[PDB]
Write a protein that binds this DNA or RNA. Structure first.
Ligand SMILES: [Zn+2]
Lengths: 82, 178, 325, 135, 213
RNA sequence: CAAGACGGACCAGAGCGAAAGCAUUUGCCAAGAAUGUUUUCAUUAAUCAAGAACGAAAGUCGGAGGUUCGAAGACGAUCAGAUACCGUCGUAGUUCCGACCAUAAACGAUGCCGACCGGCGAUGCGGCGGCGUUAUUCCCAUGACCCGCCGGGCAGCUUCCGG
């Protein structure tokens, strides 16, 4: 208290903070690259997707909507993009 | 050989554990009764053995342990062990007046008073012991003394201030050949 | 056959079993109970007082600091232990005894430290207290020299050495299981079960750990692998500003802080005893309460009273219309 | 006159001890409860309405019932305690305790102590008003 | 003046074959005086027998209502009528910082006895729990209730009174409910607290013979 | 056996609702907060004279029903002067349906919206990150606990922030 550099805070405090209460707004979501266990097709899936996404050339369910992050089916592979 | 089993709540387990020697020693020493505490059924078990001196001692011990479980001190129920003409009468606080919520809590307050003082004053005049469970009142004493104590408590929990109750019970205790 | 204060405190009529009955003067002069002091003026006088030369006291001291029981014992306990050591050296050969005691081995279980095992009355699934078991329920019951000691720490160091010990019973004891307090900050163990602040780091952090000692000299400690024991739930809460005067009650943070004197009056701290021969002459079945003293208006309570209230965590919800003293 | 039982086994009755807040009833019945054996009130032992619910009347009642049951061969009793129940108070009074102790003294083996007080699930309105009850 | 108990008779009252102890007591019946038959007069009596008086090893907080049906020469043959927990046990089980879950079914046995079963269960505090309360949410409560109804419905429909009474004595239904409800919320003290007799078939004499011996 | 009533204990400084208020099971019906979103619109907002929905209990009209309780009223006791208290019975009412009434210590005796100024950990819901125990070691997720973090809540403790 009484001594806090408001311009340059630690990354731990900014990741701890609510997303609208950061020094500059930044979302907590991401676009993850998903590969089905069956086919080789690349799909891009939002981390908090509300809709059930299907593989285009396989017609296979990739994830289910949840209260927060969309959980993937078992066996699917994913990586966070950039 | 017959037995009596009485339950214990979760809030009286630790007082039972701390006061356990002071409970089981008078029951087994001069009354001659077997005693155990079943942890699975949460029951105090009192039994008659060959060493029991007389009949109805097991009833005396059952009243003693029941009074301890209801919230009385170990010596105040050892009074039930020694004396014959002592009883344990209890009632709910809503039995005389339908009280809801905060009103009810205030009624509990004016059985206790500040620091418990009011309660102790009744215990000084009526020669009883009063235990206040959460919505329950238990009186230990003689029959006429139980009547005086319940009159004081019922007067308190329908609105009377404590000073009027003190004056009334002191006049009654003067009239009761105490 | 040496007698500690626990022999006379528990009324051990054991002068017949022994012949080398040796006691210190300070074990017999520090007793304050009137009944056993009256008993000592009636009992047959076969005991004789004997004082140890201090080389044995020195050696008992350096392995008392090694066994981890030196803060637990007192000075007169060291005197009694040196007395039985020096008589075992004087009469029996000394080479029977091993020094520099063994290492303790760790074996933990899932049982809570507050599980009521080895309590005589309690029974899980028979365990009965009968009139034929009262004289026998003392502790876990199991040639020329012996002890009459009930304190556990002396027994712990004594069986760590290897002297046979006996109690107010007849037959000697081979195994001793009990409880100790262990600090989980500084890892210093105390045999004093009454204390709540440890002697080394001074924090309110001692927790119960069970111990078992064999006659061979093996100590082993049972810990509890229960996360409820080491849970920091109600430990951090806002404390009020420190207050002084004649009526302040501070939150008791250290073992030696100076509290103001707030004692109950003698009428307030009398409990009725019902088996007195003159009890029936009384006008009331119970002792009259204290409603007139100044300690009644200040709501002074006994130290043992209200223990479960202190055990609730302060960051919780009490009932709306109550105040916690 | 009574059951033809060997000395080892006991004859069981069921003693309903109902302590109302004006007197006390000691009602020994069959194990079924349909056929009765004995019953004396607080009022048939003391000749005063003031002392009708007193433990004196209850204990005299218990001795009278115990003697009558010794006459008819019943040696042991199960106990079914009772208060008025319903809207009223639920705890059996000191008269029920006095009757229980007095029949315990009078040579009776005691079976099961069980409380049947008619606790309502969800009651009707109390006999007193909003102002209160009992002085 | 004339003693009423001189004309009375003592009849044996005996339990069915499902229990180890048969003779559950004596009953007092006024003799047949021409108009009313003593055998017919005793035929509608309900006996409240604690289960520890019926089996040696079994716990004593369960009571069986047993109704008599036939008279066999100073023997009163008896049949199962109901079952209920002791009020002391019920008052001890209802603690504060937990949830009470109730269920009931109207279910019919294979031999025509229509019963009403009640089931009580409590949420359990775990052995490492720090929180004071163990409240279950409403959908969890509904799922537990639905599972209890399904379990006791399938356990009573497939049997008659013989196996139903034989599984009510150790409460196999209660232990099955406790084991099956762990995947939703851990249950603490589950019992079939009450069994009611709603409908009985036409009375048969042979049926009581295999129920007795 | 029937009748009407009421949903105890569980039941908490817990929850929901604009308030009055709301607690037996199941099903149906439309609502709603909060949370989550790198969704969409792009100032659409706040407070509001006039006006309008809801509004405990009591009470008034029509119908039904009346278990308990019960104003009035009838008795019995109680006393220099008692006509309120107490006990028994009991009508309107207390219950339901459809119309009225718009009042309470209808309370936090504290307008609503927005901003800033000390701290702490419990709880309710949602979300996130997790080493472990459990659904007799669960074959993988998922429920129950355990440790933190974020958002909106019901509240609490502490403080010489300032008043
Ligand atoms: Zn330490």
């Amino acid at each position: 208290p009484l001594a806090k550099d408001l311009l340059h805070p630690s990354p731990e405090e900014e990741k701890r903070k609510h997303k609208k209460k950061r020094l500059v707004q930044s979302p907590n979501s991401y676009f993850m690259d998903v590969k089905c266990p069956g086919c080789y097709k690349i799909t891009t899936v939002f981390s908090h997707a509300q809709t059930v996404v299907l593989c285009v050339g396989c017609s296979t369910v990739l994830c289910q909507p949840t209260g927060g992050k969309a959980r993937l089916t078992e066996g699917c592979s994913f990586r966070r993009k950039q | 050989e017959e037995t009596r089993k009485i339950p214990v709540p979760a809030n009286r387990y630790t007082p039972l554990k701390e006061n356990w020697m002071k409970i089981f020693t008078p029951i087994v020493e001069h009354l001659g009764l077997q005693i155990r505490f079943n942890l699975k059924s949460r029951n105090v078990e009192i039994r008659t053995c060959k060493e029991t001196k007389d009949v109805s001692a097991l009833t005396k011990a059952a009243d003693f342990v029941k009074a301890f479980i209801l919230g009385f001190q170990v010596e105040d129920a050892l009074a039930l062990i020694r004396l014959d003409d002592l009883f344990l009468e209890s009632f709910e606080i809503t039995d005389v007046k339908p009280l809801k919520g905060d009103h009810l809590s205030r009624a509990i307050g004016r059985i206790a008073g500040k620091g418990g003082k009011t309660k102790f004053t009744i215990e000084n005049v009526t020669r009883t012991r009063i235990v206040l469970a959460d919505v329950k009142v238990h009186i230990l004493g003689s029959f006429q003394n139980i009547k005086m104590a319940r009159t004081a408590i019922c007067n308190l929990i329908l609105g009377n201030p404590p000073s009027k109750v003190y004056g009334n019970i002191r006049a009654v205790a003067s009239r009761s050949a105490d | 056959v040496v007698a500690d204060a626990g022999a006379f405190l528990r009324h051990a009529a054991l002068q017949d079993i022994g012949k080398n009955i040796y006691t210190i003067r300070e074990v017999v002069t520090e007793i304050r109970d009137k009944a056993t002091r009256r008993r000592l003026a009636v009992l047959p006088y076969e005991l004789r007082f004997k004082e140890p030369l201090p080389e044995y006291v020195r050696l008992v001291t350096e392995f008392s600091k090694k066994t981890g029981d030196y803060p637990s014992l007192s000075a007169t306990d060291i005197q009694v232990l040196a007395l039985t050591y020096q008589l075992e050296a004087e009469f029996v050969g000394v080479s029977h005894l091993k020094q520099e005691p063994q290492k303790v081995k760790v074996s933990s279980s899932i049982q809570h430290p507050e599980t009521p095992l080895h309590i005589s009355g309690f029974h899980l699934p028979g365990g009965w207290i009968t009139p034929s078991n009262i004289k026998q329920i003392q502790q876990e019951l199991e040639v020329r020299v012996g002890c009459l000691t009930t304190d556990f720490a002396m027994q712990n160091v004594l069986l760590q050495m290897g002297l046979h010990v006996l109690a107010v019973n007849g037959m000697l004891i081979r195994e001793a299981r009990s409880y100790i307090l262990r600090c989980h900050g500084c890892f210093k163990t105390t045999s004093d079960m009454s204390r709540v602040f440890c002697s080394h780091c001074g924090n309110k952090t001692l927790k119960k750990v069970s111990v078992t000692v064999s006659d061979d000299g093996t100590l082993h400690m049972h810990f509890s692998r229960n996360p409820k024991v080491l849970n920091p739930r109600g430990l951090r809460y806002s404390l009020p500003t420190p207050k002084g005067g004649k009526y302040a009650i501070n939150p008791h943070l250290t073992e030696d802080q100076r509290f103001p004197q707030l004692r109950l009056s003698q009428k307030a701290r009398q409990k009725t005893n019902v088996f007195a021969p003159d009890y029936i002459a009384g006008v009331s079945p119970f002792v009259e309460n204290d409603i007139s003293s100044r300690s009644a208006t200040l709501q002074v309570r006994d130290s043992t009273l209200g223990a479960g209230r202190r055990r609730l965590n302060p960051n919780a919800s009490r009932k709306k219309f109550v105040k916690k003293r | 006159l009574g059951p033809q039982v060997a000395e080892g086994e006991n004859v069981f009755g069921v003693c309903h001890i109902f302590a109302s807040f004006n007197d006390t009833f000691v009602h020994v019945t069959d194990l079924s409860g349909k056929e009765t054996i004995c019953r004396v009130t607080g009022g048939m032992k003391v000749k005063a309405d003031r002392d009708e619910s007193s433990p004196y009347a209850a204990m005299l009642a218990a001795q009278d019932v115990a003697q009558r049951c010794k006459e008819l061969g019943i040696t042991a009793l199960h106990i079914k305690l009772r208060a008025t129940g319903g809207n009223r108070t639920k705890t059996p009074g000191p008269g029920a305790q006095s009757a229980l102790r007095a029949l315990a003294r009078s040579g009776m083996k005691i079976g099961r102590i069980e409380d049947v007080t008619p606790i309502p699930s969800d009651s009707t309105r109390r006999k007193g008003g909003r102002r209160g009850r009992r002085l | 003046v004339v003693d009423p108990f001189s004309k009375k008779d003592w009849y044996d009252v005996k339990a069915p074959a499902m229990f180890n102890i048969r003779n559950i007591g004596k009953t007092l019946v006024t003799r047949t005086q021409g108009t009313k038959i003593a055998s017919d007069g005793l035929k509608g009596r309900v006996f409240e027998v604690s289960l520890a008086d019926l089996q040696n090893d079994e716990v004593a907080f369960r009571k069986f209502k047993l109704i008599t049906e036939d008279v066999q020469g100073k023997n009163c043959l008896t049949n199962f009528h109901g079952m209920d927990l002791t009020r002391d046990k019920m008052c001890s089980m209802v603690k504060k910082w937990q949830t009470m879950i109730e269920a009931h079914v109207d279910v019919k046995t294979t031999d025509g006895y229509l019963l009403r079963l009640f089931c009580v269960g409590f949420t359990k505090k775990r052995n490492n729990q720090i929180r004071k309360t163990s409240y279950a949410q409403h959908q969890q409560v509904r799922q537990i209730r639905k599972k209890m109804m399904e379990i006791m419905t399938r356990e009573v429909q497939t049997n008659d009174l013989k196996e139903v009474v034989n599984k009510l004595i150790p409460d196999s239904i209660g232990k099955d409910i406790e084991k099956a409800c762990q995947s939703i919320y851990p249950l603490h003290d589950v019992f079939v607290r009450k069994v009611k007799m709603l409908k009985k078939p036409k009375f048969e004499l042979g049926k009581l013979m295999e129920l007795h011996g």
